[PDB]
Scaffold this active site. Structure first.
Site, PDB file in Angstrom:
ATOM      1  N   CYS A  56      -1.835   8.719   3.396  1.00 30.49           N
ATOM      2  CA  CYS A  56      -2.692   8.425   4.543  1.00 30.49           C
ATOM      3  C   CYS A  56      -2.247   7.217   5.349  1.00 30.49           C
ATOM      4  CB  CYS A  56      -4.146   8.198   4.130  1.00 30.49           C
ATOM      5  SG  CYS A  56      -4.861   9.574   3.283  1.00 30.49           S
ATOM      6  N   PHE A  87       0.815  -1.214   0.000  1.00 27.88           N
ATOM      7  CA  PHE A  87       0.000   0.000   0.000  1.00 27.88           C
ATOM      8  C   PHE A  87       0.850   1.266   0.000  1.00 27.88           C
ATOM      9  CE2 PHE A  87       0.029  -1.293   4.523  1.00 27.88           C
ATOM     10  CZ  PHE A  87       0.570  -0.155   5.109  1.00 27.88           C
TER      11      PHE A  87
END
EC number: 1.1.1.22
Lengths: 465, 462, 462
Positions: A277, A273
Site C-alpha cells: 500500500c 515501512f
C-alpha cells in the site's frame, strides 16, 4: 425519473482480499441482497466454495459459511453475474507499470479496463459500477468512457475505496472509521450514490458514510496512505538526528505523540515501512503530481519515499562499516523477512532491500522468518538480484540459532516478538568475535545486550552516551 | 538537591508570566518570583492592567500577587534566594552569519546564564522554558561550571502554549515534558521539578526524558504540525488541477483515527512566531549534523508554505491580465490567524509584498491589527518608501472594496462572511474578482452575484 | 455590423499614423481619425512637418488631411462615432514582477479597452493593430463583455511595417493577416475588415485565421527572422575558427530557393524595437504553457545575439593587451542599423557597455543619432556618472579616431567605407587595431595599410 432503483443484486469482479470479505459483509448484513463474487481463476473460486477458505480472517469463516448458497455465491461465470447484477464492484489489481511512461510509479489500468470492457459487453441494462480496489485519480473517467461506448444501457461509475487491513478485515468492514463514496455531480450520479449509501446504511451509521465527488474520493485514498507513510518517514528522519545528538527516538516519539492534534499512532521508527500500500500509493500520487505539472508537490511527497530508502541504505552502511568495510564470504544472520510481524506478506519488505545491499558486498546471508515461505523468500531476492546470486549468497533457516551460528552479525529487520528473549548470551557465544547486533525494529534491550558483550546498534540511539 | 520552595523565572513575557501564575495558583506553598529588566513591564504586572491579555489570567494573578506570586525587577536578588530558576527569554533568529535566517541567536540565553553565574550563592536547578536550539543546555552548563571552578543541574522543560488558551493549556496540558542529565544528580533535579507539576498534573501526563530528547521534541512537535498544514496545502493544488475539493479530501482523510482531523485546514499558508522558526531551526540543526537528507525533507514544509503564498498571488496577478500597476485591490485580513492582532510571519504580509512588487494599489482592512503595526511590518519586508506609495489602510471593508479590481481574503475573520457582496460587486471595477485564501466564503453565492471567484483547493471551472 | 464608414485608430505613432493614412488614401469614402492623448504629437500631425519621415507619406497625408483624414486628441468623441476601432498602443515589457524582462504589459491595451467600453454607445469592431501577446484579445473581450450588460467583436490585424519602407509595405503588402472569433458574428466582423483591405489588396494576399493564430503568427514571424540572423551569426564564429568566410557561406546557403537569400547578413548582432522583444514574448508564452523545451529553443536566438556582442567585445579587449583602462577606443556607429537615428536595442549600446566595464575611454561617432539620445541610452545601462567619466561624443570620425588604439565599426553606415584609413592609421596609437562588426570594410586594404584588422566571419590569421 428513476434510472437506478433499489439494489437487490450485487456482483464483485475479483475474488481476492478486498472483494471476498467486502461481499461477505454485504451478504451477512443484507439478507435481502443476492451477492455474487466472480473471478476467472476457477481454482480460487473452488477454494471459496470449499471447506477451507483461501484467506484466514477472524470472523470470516462464520460469515461466509452461514451465507454461502443462501445469499452469498462464488462463481466463475462472469457474463451471467454481470447480466443479472444491479450494482457491480470492480476489485482487481492495478500493478505498477514496469516499463515506459510512469515506469515504477504509475498504476497499470489493464485489469480495470478489462473488467470495464466485459461489463460493456454483457450488461443488458442500467448498472452502477463501483471502483473498490485502489485506482489512480480519474480512473472512473476511463471506466465511464469504456461503458458509454456500449450505450449505443445507462451507467453510473462510483468510487468506494477500501480501508481494510490484513488480520482485522471483519472488524474494519463491520465497524469502519468511515465509508467513502464518490459519484458524478449530476442527478443520475446522485441517484447512484444514494443506492450505494442505502446498502451501507443496513449496518453503518449515516454519519460515518461520507459522500463526495468521484475525484475527491479517489484522491482521498492515496492521500490518507501518503499521510500515514509521511508520519513514519518523519519519525525515521528524526531517528538519525537522535543518533547524531544523543537524544532518543523512543523518547521523542512519546513526547511528540502526546499532542492530541498529532496523535500517538504511526510514530514507530524502523528500518522503514513496507507493504503493498504505502510506497505504491505515495508513488501514484507523485506520478499524478508530475502529470499535473505540480513538480513542487511531487518533490514534497517523493521525500517520503527518499527518506524510506535512505533509512534502509544508511542502516546497511552501518553494518558494512562496523564489519571493517569488508563482508565477502562473511556470515550474517538476518532475523526477519516479512514486511511486518504477524504475516507471511513480503511485499515491499525492508528486509528484501537491506539484504540486497548486503548481497552487493558479497555477504553470506542466513535468513530466518517464522512465517514466510522459503520459496517466496528465494523468489523475492531473485527478482531484485538474480537466481544465481541468491544460489551463491542465500541460505534460509527454519531456526534462528541455526542462522546466528558462526555469524559476524545479527540484523533484526522484522519486529517478531519471538526475537525478544531469544537466548542472546548463547547466540553471542556461538558467533564470531567481536560480535555485532543491529536492531532495525527497536524491540531489543540495548543495556542487556551491551552487558552480554555485543557491539550493539539500534535505529534512533547514539552508539556512545 | 534540594527540595524546592522558591521559584524564579527570568523573562516576564508570554511564557514566563502565565507559567509562574499557574504555579502559584496550584501550589500555595511555593513562593514564585518573576524577574525582568524592563521595569515598566514589571510595573504593568504589578498594576490593575496586566501587560498581556490572557483569558482568566487576571483572576489567577490578583488572587496570588503579594501572596505567593511576586513581580520584581531586582534580578540579582531573586537569583540569590531561589532553589529553581526558569529561563524564559527569546532566541531571535540570526540576522547574519552562520545560520543567517535559520539559527536561533543564543545571546539572551547567554546573558541570563552569565547573570546566574555571578549572583548565585548556592546550588540551583536551571530550567530552559522558552524554545532553545538542541544542545543549548551544554552552553548554559558550560557558563555555569566557570562559577564552580555552587552545584548546578540544567534542565529542559519546553512550553506548549497557544495565545488565548494559555491558562487552559497550563491547567490541562496534553503533556508536561522534562529532560535532564542521565546521572544521580541529574535524575534528582528532574524529580524535584516533577514534584512541582504533580501538584496539578496527572503523573501519567508527565513525561521525563534526557535533555536533548526534550529540546528536540519541542521543535519536532511544531515541525509535525506545520507538516500537516503543508501536506494538506500541497493537496489543495492537486484538487484545483483535478476537480477534487480540498474540503472533501480533508474530511475523508481526517476520519482515519491514526491521522486525526486536527490541522487539516488548507489556507494561503501557516504563520505565527513558532512554526517556521522551529522548522528552520530544525533544518539548520540537520545541516550542522551533516544530515542533508533530513534537512531537505523538513525544508519541504517551508518550501510548500512559500509556494502556496507565491502561487496564490500569481493567480491574482494572472487574472488581472498580468498587469496590476496602479490597480486597486482590496485585502480582507492582516493577522496570521483570526481573533488576534498578532501578525508575526503572517501570510497576508507575504502575499501583499508579492502584489506590491507588481506595483498594485492595496487597501488593507483588518478588524483588529493596528494601522501602525501593518505599515511597519510591510516596511520591513519592503521599504517605508514603497509602503507610502502603494498601501492605504481602511477601518471600513466597504471603503477598501470601493473601486477595487480584486478582493483578496487572507485571514479567516468571521465578519468577512456575509458582508454585502452584492453591494461590494456593484462598487467594484468590472470584471470583478474575489480570491479566498481561507476557505470561508460561499463560492456558489459569489458566482451568482457575478464575481469571477476563486478559492484555494477548488477548481475554477465546474 | 454594417459596411464600415468611420474608422478610428487609438495611437498616433509609427503604426497607426501610416496605416490610417493608407486607408484614408485608398478609401475616399471612409472617414479616418487618428487619436492620441499626446496633444503635441497630434499637433505635429496637423502641421506642415509630419512627426515621422517616410518616403511617400507626405504626398498621402497632406492630400487627405482635413478631407477624410483627421488627427485628434478627442478620444471619447472618436470612439463614440467609429464603426471600427484600431488599437495601436505600445505594450512595453514588464519591468518588475511576473514576466519581468519578457512579458508585455497590457496596461495601455487595457486603458483603451475600458475607454471603448465607457464611450462606445453602439456596435464596434475592435482591432488589435499593434503587437500583442497571444490571448490579448481575450482580455479585451472580457472588458467589452462587462459593458454590454453595445455589440463587440475583437479582431487581430498585425502590423508588418518597417521604418523607411512603410508606404511600400502598406500599399503592396506581402500579405494582410486578419484573425477573428470562430463564430458567425466573428466571421461577419472579419468580412468587414477584409472589405476595407480589398479596396487595394488582392484577395489572394489577404489571409484570414482564428484570433490566436493571427496574434501568434506575428511573434513567430519576427522570431523566424531573428533566428536567421542568429543562425548565420553562430556560423560566423565557425568561419573564424576554420578559415571559411561567412560572406561566401551566406551567399552559397542563400541561393537555395527554399532558404532564400534575405536576412543572412552576419553582424555584431540584430537590434531594433521588434526582434528581441517579440522572441522574448514568445519565450515567456512557452514557459507559461509549460513548454520549457520550446522556450529554451527560442531563447537560443537571444543567447547567440548576446554571445555575438560579448565575444566581439572580448576580441577588442584581448587584442589591446587585455587592458583598456583610460585607453582610447573610437566607435564608428551607434544606431541599431544604418540610415536611421533609432537606437532601440542597438548592438552598439551593448558593445560600448562591455567596453565601459573595462574603463575604456570611448569616442563615439554616428552620422545621425543625437548626442543626447546617445548619452541617455548609455546611462540607462550604466550610470550618468559612468558616461560623464568614459564617454565622448564626436561629430567627426577622424576626431574620434585621433590617438585611438582601436577602431570599432558597430553600424553599417556607408560613409565608413572609403574614409581615409591611411591617415587614420597614421594618427592612431601603434600598433593600431580595427574591428569590423558589420562586414563593410576591405580587409586586405586595411592589412596593407598596416592595421591589425579583424572582421566577424573572417579568420584573423589568413
Amino acid at each position: 425519473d428513476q434510472v437506478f432503483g433499489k439494489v437487490s443484486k450485487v456482483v464483485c469482479v475479483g475474488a481476492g482480499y478486498v472483494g471476498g470479505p467486502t461481499c461477505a459483509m454485504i451478504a451477512h448484513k443484507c439478507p435481502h441482497i443476492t451477492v455474487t463474487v466472480v473471478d476467472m481463476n476457477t481454482a480460487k473460486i473452488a477454494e471459496w466454495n470449499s471447506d477451507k477458505l483461501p484467506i484466514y480472517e477472524p470472523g470470516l469463516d462464520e460469515i461466509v459459511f452461514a451465507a454461502r448458497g443462501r445469499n452469498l455465491f462464488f462463481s466463475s461465470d462472469i457474463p451471467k453475474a454481470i447480466a443479472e447484477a444491479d450494482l457491480i464492484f470492480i476489485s482487481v489489481n492495478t500493478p505498477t507499470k514496469m516499463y515506459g511512461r510512469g515506469k515504477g510509479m504509475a498504476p497499470d489500468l489493464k485489469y480495470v479496463e478489462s473488467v470495464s470492457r466485459t461489463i460493456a459487453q454483457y450488461a443488458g441494462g442500467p448498472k452502477i459500477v463501483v471502483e473498490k480496489s485502489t485506482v489512480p485519480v480519474k480512473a472512473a473517467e476511463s471506466i465511464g468512457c469504456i461503458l458509454r461506448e456500449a450505450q449505443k444501457l445507462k451507467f453510473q461509475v462510483l468510487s468506494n475505496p477500501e480501508f481494510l487491513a490484513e488480520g482485522t478485515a471483519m472488524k474494519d468492514l463491520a465497524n469502519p472509521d468511515r465509508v467513502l463514496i464518490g459519484g458524478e455531480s449530476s442527478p443520475e450520479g446522485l441517484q447512484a450514490v444514494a443506492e450505494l449509501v442505502r446498502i451501507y446504511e443496513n449496518w453503518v451509521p449515516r454519519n460515518r458514510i461520507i459522500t463526495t465527488n468521484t475525484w475527491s474520493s479517489e484522491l482521498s485514498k492515496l492521500v490518507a496512505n501518503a499521510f500515514l507513510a509521511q508520519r513514519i518517514s518523519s519519525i525515521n528522519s528524526i531517528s538519525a538526528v537522535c543518533e547524531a545528538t544523543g537524544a532518543e527516538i523512543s523518547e521523542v516519539a512519546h513526547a511528540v505523540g502526546y499532542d492530541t492534534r498529532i496523535g500517538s499512532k504511526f510514530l514507530q521508527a524502523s528500518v522503514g515501512f513496507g507493504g503493498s500500500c504505502f510506497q505504491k500509493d505515495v508513488l501514484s500520487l507523485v506520478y499524478l503530481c508530475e502529470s499535473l505539472n505540480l513538480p513542487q508537490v511531487a518533490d514534497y511527497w517523493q521525500g517520503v519515499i527518499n527518506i524510506n530508502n535512505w533509512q534502509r541504505r544508511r542502516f546497511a552502511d552501518k553494518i558494512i562499516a562496523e564489519l571493517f568495510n569488508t563482508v565477502t564470504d562473511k556470515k550474517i544472520a538476518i532475523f526477519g523477512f516479512a514486511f511486518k510481524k504477524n504475516t507471511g506478506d513480503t511485499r515491499e519488505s525492508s528486509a528484501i532491500h537491506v539484504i540486497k545491499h548486503l548481497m552487493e558486498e558479497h555477504a553470506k546471508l542466513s535468513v530466518y522468518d517464522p512465517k514466510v515461505q522459503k520459496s517466496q523468500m528465494l523468489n523475492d531476492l531473485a527478482s531484485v538480484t538474480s537466481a544465481q546470486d541468491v544460489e551463491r549468497l542465500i541460505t534460509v533457516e527454519s531456526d534462528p540459532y541455526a542462522a546466528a551460528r558462526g555469524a559476524h552479525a545479527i540484523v533484526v529487520l522484522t519486529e517478531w516478538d519471538e526475537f525478544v528473549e531469544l537466548n542472546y548470551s548463547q547466540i553471542h557465544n556461538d558467533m564470531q568475535h567481536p560480535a555485532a547486533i543491529f536492531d532495525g525494529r527497536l524491540i531489543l534491550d540495548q543495556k542487556a545486550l551491551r552487558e552480554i558483550g555485543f557491539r550493539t546498534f539500534a535505529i534512533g540511539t547514539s552508539p556512545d552516551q
